[PDB]
Design a protein around this ligand. Structure first.
Ligand SMILES: Nc1ncnc2c1ncn2[C@@H]1O[C@H](COP(=O)(O)CP(=O)(O)OP(=O)(O)O)[C@@H](O)[C@H]1O
Ligand SMILES: Nc1ncnc2c1ncn2[C@@H]1O[C@H](COP(=O)(O)CP(=O)(O)OP(=O)(O)O)[C@@H](O)[C@H]1O
Ligand SMILES: N[C@@H](CCCC[NH3+])C(=O)O
Ligand SMILES: N[C@@H](CCCC[NH3+])C(=O)O
Ligand SMILES: [Mg+2]
Ligand SMILES: [Mg+2]
Lengths: 506, 31, 501
């Protein structure tokens, strides 16, 4: 049968139902009990059982309609990740006439309401035997018969509702995603953090390195930018005396789409007064391992980066996490000494790293800055070794415009990134609170922005002023929720953990 | 570790003040 | 002294601390105990008492530096909206030279860490007596000796440093959001995130922000409501969803409007707006009782020296039907409800709007006229929480038609203090009717209603796959926040409100 024909015919049929006052879209059906509770309550029933003294109203979507007579029709009711059989017998329905009528009405895909008695077939399938079946909302389209589920990603991501009907695991991915977010909130709330909201539109975007979205405000005749990170606002709040803050919210980047990249994504940021990044490493260990254990039942999870048609990695979130220092470990991987860390701002250094990238075949598209070449090298040699949760620590100041200088190692900063499965999930640092250094760094950033780099960031003077009023010694932290969602739902693709991911149109 | 700060709320969670009963039960997804 | 010179002098002094290596911005100071816990632990001390076996590190900002002289100084150390006296006398310090150095170093506004002993004064004031004081972060400016609203909203950190009540408002805001989440979570709702940039903006009546996605050569609109996505998820089989998230409007920035604001939207399968009325009563009433202690709340819509309104959130909330109570308030009969799409009716409502001096800017559609009349005669009677129910379909393009009253919809708005805080309705699940109403909306958008809706054909398709009987609901968190913090300005409940530079 042809799906368009099916649609035309079915639309006609429902229209007919409308003109007959047969009410194909009722207003209210009173559900007595969830399918889940119904199953949990009446599973103990024996084959052949039929409770005459219990009558219940359940609802759901028809997955299948099959006959075993002209007086016997079985419907497969689905809901809540679960199934219940509707055993519609003529003898138990209110009329023969109405039984015939309702069975002529219903097609696979319909939302129905069922009022009936709990029972179980001779085979032993728990069922509900209907006194009355009510059409709650008809499905006008033909739902696909599929052998391997809905696999076509275009269909799955554009029509998420289809994915959710036809595929059982999708639901659980988004449940897990919610569990993550809620767990984090509970963690932080219990540590005395105040959940806050900061602006998503600013006049100058800051907090990370990214190409922003630009929109126009009509009444004010100025451009606003969509935010890339709430960082600077939080630090201002800490100056104002709120010692512990967090926000779980959306961030925006005008980039492209890949497996780890959507234009809008969810992050959690928190800022904590009188903490340094060692404290943040300890809290991060507790939060991530706790999260994984609470949600999945264990510290060990399996990941298939290349899909189920590929290798499985065993990821161990058992604390403590491996720690590596970026520069030393990069040297160790390269088998060569890199220049002294106080010499990273020089051209000699840039030239050395350039040569090494060329010789090790690591691409760095222009501009081939020291910071970028470093990043590409780290990505090639260190990040790939990070299967289990690994802290990469002590980044150069040239990669970290807002991180406080390292108290031992000149040219470095008190910063870390959490890597899991070769990808970054956290970024944190002891915050820079010296207004002068912060302004200098902003100035170098603005100089790099003058040469043409659209990701390198602006000078926020309000933020520098705020620093001048006295930002306490503070440590800050950011986490990519979507990525954590990926690794905990065994998704190799960010489109899997976004309900409605961005798609280049058709 | 880091000094104790008391939770701004609890000690969650509320709706121990109010849970309506007009609609069938679904269980808390976090439980 | 002069602030711009104070700043230069301080800058120089701190710079000198840097070049001398006395470390004005230390990396790490270990606080042993919060000021709140300190106070809770040692408030019970007798005056003149002085626990010497206990040494503790605390931290905070300096609000006042006063010296008795010359071996003694008192510091007013604040944090967490509490205060602690630092009683610094020379004989208790580590050394008299270091005492002198450290006091000569400090100024008011400075973040400092204090290591010392708990003890009261004879005067009775709970204090810490320092073995050592460390400068954590210098304040380079003159702090004000703060009421000016523009100055508070533009420098929120000053506001939070100087004014104690702001912090409390934001704590209340947070408690409201947290309560809502607990409430819906416990009711079996899945907390979800839907896109904040769309191709077609839908869900509400509003004028969107437009922005451009470079790598797609495509314009995207910032969202005005999550509604259509939620309904699509209910289609998907997720029976209960909610989202507490941001929303955007390209509009006027004012006393009650910000270009970005926060709503909670939830959708519930197999519910109708009656069910949603019960749920709303329970949620709001309980929320208020939980946050404030009582169902009773006093509010000042204009000034603290203005008319005070006393509001009773005790359920059940008053209910009024829109057309009926408009007929009561107009002293006249209105057209039969199945006549509301006629220009006869539009003309009648225009004549009634003129006759009772109600201003309706163009375009004077039946809906805008109706809304203006409801605003004038009905909303002003809504001091206590009041459900205004059974809106006409012309005002409610996504609402399901009333099951008795033709021309009406199964909808309510919740009003407190003459302002809308909730909007909810039995959801329209008929794809044909919805398409028709979208087409009517598109006609009204071609003839120049600027906030009028577009045509989501995808949403319509979803409806064709079948949306179960569902009821939906929305709440303006910012307004609830205003009402529970006695704020008549929305800037009072947004940490960094939009300002018109
Ligand atoms: N479009 C997007 N989708 C999901 N997460 C994003 C994102 N853009 C940024 N992030 C988050 O912010 C962080 C930014 O990472 P960066 O190191 O600045 C560039 P990357 O491409 O993620 O790393 P890489 O280029 O070394 O592979 C990531 O950890 C990620 O969690
Ligand atoms: N700029 C804004 N600031 C705060 N809330 C807003 C808002 N715009 C819309 N809302 C929310 O949306 C609801 C009313 O929206 P509108 O349709 O625009 C009626 P309005 O009050 O004339 O404006 C209220 O519950 C309110 O919380
Ligand atoms: N805003 C940062 C995360 C916080 C880093 C610590 N202050 C980012 O986008 O990576
Ligand atoms: N989107 C609506 C709230 C949801 C109403 C129920 N569908 C609004 O902006 O007010
Ligand atoms: Mg990174
Ligand atoms: Mg309104």
């Amino acid at each position: 049968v042809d799906p368009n024909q099916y649609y035309k015919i079915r639309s006609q049929a429902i229209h007919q139902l409308k003109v007959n006052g047969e009410d194909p879209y009722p207003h209210k059906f009173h559900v007595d009990i969830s399918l889940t509770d119904f199953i949990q309550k009446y599973s103990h029933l024996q084959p052949g059982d039929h409770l005459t003294d219990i009558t219940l109203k359940v609802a759901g979507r028809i997955h299948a309609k099959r006959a075993s007579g002209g007086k016997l029709i079985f419907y497969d009711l689905r809901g809540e990740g679960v199934k219940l059989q509707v055993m519609a017998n003529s003898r138990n329905y209110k009329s023969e006439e109405e039984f015939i009528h309702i069975n002529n009405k219903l097609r696979r895909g319909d939302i129905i309401g069922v009022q009936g008695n709990p029972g179980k077939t001779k085979k032993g399938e728990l069922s509900i035997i209907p006194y009355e079946i009510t059409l709650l909302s008809p499905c006008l389209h033909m739902l696909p018969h599929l052998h391997f589920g809905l696999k076509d990603k275009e269909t799955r991501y554009r029509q998420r509702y289809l994915d959710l009907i036809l595929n059982d695991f999708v639901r659980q991915k988004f449940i897990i995603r919610s569990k993550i977010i809620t767990y984090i909130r509970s963690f932080l709330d219990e540590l005395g953090f105040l959940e806050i909201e900061t602006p998503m539109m600013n006049i100058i975007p800051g907090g990370a390195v990214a190409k922003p979205f630009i929109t126009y405000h009509n009444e004010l005749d100025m451009n606003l930018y969509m935010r890339i990170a709430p960082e600077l606002y939080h630090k201002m709040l800490v100056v104002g005396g709120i010692d512990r803050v967090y926000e779980i919210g959306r961030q925006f980047r005008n980039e492209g789409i890949d497996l780890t990249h959507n234009p809008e994504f969810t992050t959690c940021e928190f800022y904590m007064a009188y903490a340094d990044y060692h404290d943040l490493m300890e809290i991060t260990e507790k939060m991530v391992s706790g999260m994984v254990k609470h949600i999945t039942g264990s510290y060990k999870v399996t990941y298939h980066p290349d899909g189920p048609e590929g290798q499985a990695y065993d990821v161990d979130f058992t604390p403590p996490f491996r720690r590596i220092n970026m520069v030393e470990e990069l040297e160790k991987a390269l088998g060569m000494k890199l220049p002294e860390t106080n010499l990273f701002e020089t051209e000699e250094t840039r030239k050395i790293l350039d040569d090494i990238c060329v010789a090790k075949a690591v691409e760095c598209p222009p501009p081939r800055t020291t910071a970028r070449l470093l990043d590409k090298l780290v990505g090639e040699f260190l990040e790939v070794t990070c299967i289990n949760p690994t802290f990469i620590c002590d980044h150069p100041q040239i990669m970290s415009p807002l991180a406080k200088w390292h108290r031992s190692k000149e040219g470095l900063t008190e910063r870390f990134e959490l890597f899991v499965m070769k990808k970054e999930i956290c970024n944190a640092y002891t915050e820079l609170n010296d207004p002068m250094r912060q302004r200098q760094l902003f100035e170098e950033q603005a100089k790099a922005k003058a040469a043409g780099d659209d990701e390198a960031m602006f000078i926020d003077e309000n933020f520098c002023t705020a620093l001048e009023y006295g930002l306490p010694p503070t440590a800050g932290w950011g986490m990519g929720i979507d990525r954590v969602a990926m690794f905990l739902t065994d998704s190799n693709n960010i489109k899997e953990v976004l309900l409605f991911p961005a798609m280049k149109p058709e | 570790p880091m000094y104790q700060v008391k939770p701004y709320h609890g000690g969650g969670a509320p709706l121990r003040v109010e849970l309506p009963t007009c609609m069938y039960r679904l269980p808390n997804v976090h439980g």
